[PDB]
């Protein structure tokens, strides 16, 4: 039994009406020989890669064929609130919604996923996610690996867990509200440990951590390096060689890796220091995909310089915003308890050395920002348009992982959890790590967001987002 080949999302561009059609629906998938109900865009699971060009507009027709409400958000894409597809961007079951995307940012790998109010974790777990490939005139000139599905390949990495009958086992409950939804099964573009045949020379991997709650850390099985060429919001100024690459939920990195004849190697993910995430089989390096070299030459390049990264401006005078994240200590303790009871000491491996009391104690609004669980009816503030602000995000008070994502922007990290960002994280980012400490980012919003269609700012640990760790804000 050979490994299955890596599934490759179709690369989708506009029709003569300048339209892209996306259908959201339920179908079936097979995992380890057992059928499961799954959801996808234009298919049963996951989704296509929407190709966009800077300075060109496209219209997307979104047909919701689910029997429940959903929304469609373009994570990493800088668009006005009205088409951002946050929780206010409801698409009724059996209905259609169209959005016009006016792309105005550099080449990047972004993605799209649902943002249904309090149910985002389930709708992603069930299968919904797709990709966005933005191109511009600058990137084409670099002559990067660019044959889609051959030497330029998307790698969407996600865990799931399943019940004995084969269905996806998703429950938003006290334990998962506390530590997140995670599983024992790793998927790569929906497949379990596929192989990808790649030509000899450079292979470009567009990595996405599409897990609800699990952080990842990519490496190769034989320790060849990864050359990071881009982050959430696009190219770095020059490649950054790494031996390992931590990737938070919702983050993307693009890397080049060498392919040499006769020497297959795996892309792997290394055990992380996050509660619950080092339970078997994740207590050891876990393969993601096998790269199978093909004795045909790859023509892409790894250029010395990629792009121009502007200077950080002066900070004095800029609006400082305070975002204090918090969790309910009682509900945090209870969830952590159930975790430890279920899996034992292994649920903290790698870490550093029952009655109804009513609505007030409901875990569904246990997580908050600035003492408020997400309130769709009330944006927490009005941010400035076209002006840099400094947003200060604190996780002091608990030790959970909060990958913080701000909609409507690509920002620069000034401090990541109390340290200046690593070089490959110093460019354009839409996510910043917050874990027991404080982060600060420099952000600018180029588009309007009104009260009725606010931008979200939230943890991308989906179960925390769904139970309150999110705020709305307006721009302009
Ligand atoms: Cu987003
Ligand atoms: Cu997102
Ligand atoms: Cu979001
Ligand atoms: O997002
Ligand atoms: O998100």
Curated annotation (Swiss-Prot):
Keyword Signal, does the record have it?
yes
Residues that hold Cu cation 4 according to the record: 402, 459, 464
**Keywords attached to this entry:** Copper, Metal-binding, Oxidoreductase, Periplasm, Repeat, Signal
Q: What is the effect of changing residue 400 to L?
A: Strong decrease in oxidase activity with 2,6-DMP as substrate. Affects copper incorporation into the T1 copper site
Practical use, per the record, is: Triggering CueO activity at need by the addition of copper salts with minor toxic effects on E.coli cells could be used as a simple tool for biosynthetic purposes. The protein was also identified as robust host protein for use in biosensing and drug-screening applications.
EC number(s) of the enzyme? Answer: 1.16.3.4
Plastocyanin-like domain segment(s): 27-137, 199-264, 361-475
> Which sites bind Cu cation 1?
73, 405
Q: How is the cofactor bound?
A: Binds 4 Cu cations per monomer. Contains a mononuclear type 1 (T1) or 'blue' copper site, and a trinuclear copper center consisting of one type 2 (T2) or 'normal' copper site, and two type 3 (T3) or 'binuclear' copper sites.
Task: Tell me the domain comment.
Answer: Contains a methionine-rich region, which includes a helix that covers the entrance to the type 1 (T1) copper site and blocks access to the T1 site in the absence of excess copper. This methionine-rich insert is involved in the binding and oxidation of Cu(+). It also binds additional copper ions, which are important for the copper-associated regulation of activity. The methionine-rich region provides at least three additional Cu(+) binding sites: Cu5 (sCu), Cu6 and Cu7, which play related but distinct roles in CueO oxidase activities.
User: What is the role of the protein in this entry?
Assistant: Multicopper oxidase involved in copper homeostasis and copper tolerance under aerobic conditions. Is responsible for the oxidation of Cu(+) to the less harmful Cu(2+) in the periplasm, thereby preventing Cu(+) from entering the cytoplasm. Probably primarily functions as a cuprous oxidase in vivo. In vitro, in the presence of excess copper ions, exhibits ferroxidase and phenoloxidase activities. Fe(2+) is an excellent substrate in the presence of excess Cu(2+), but is inactive in the absence of Cu(2+). Oxidizes the phenolate iron siderophores enterobactin, 2,3-dihydroxybenzoate (2,3-DHB) and 3-hydroxyanthranilate (3-HAA). Oxidation and thus inactivation of enterobactin could protect cells from the interaction of enterobactin with copper and play a central role as an interface between copper detoxification and iron homeostasis.
Give the family, as the similarity comment puts it: Belongs to the multicopper oxidase family.
The protein's name is Multicopper oxidase CueO
Q: Which organism is it from?
A: Escherichia coli (strain K12)
Gene designation = cueO
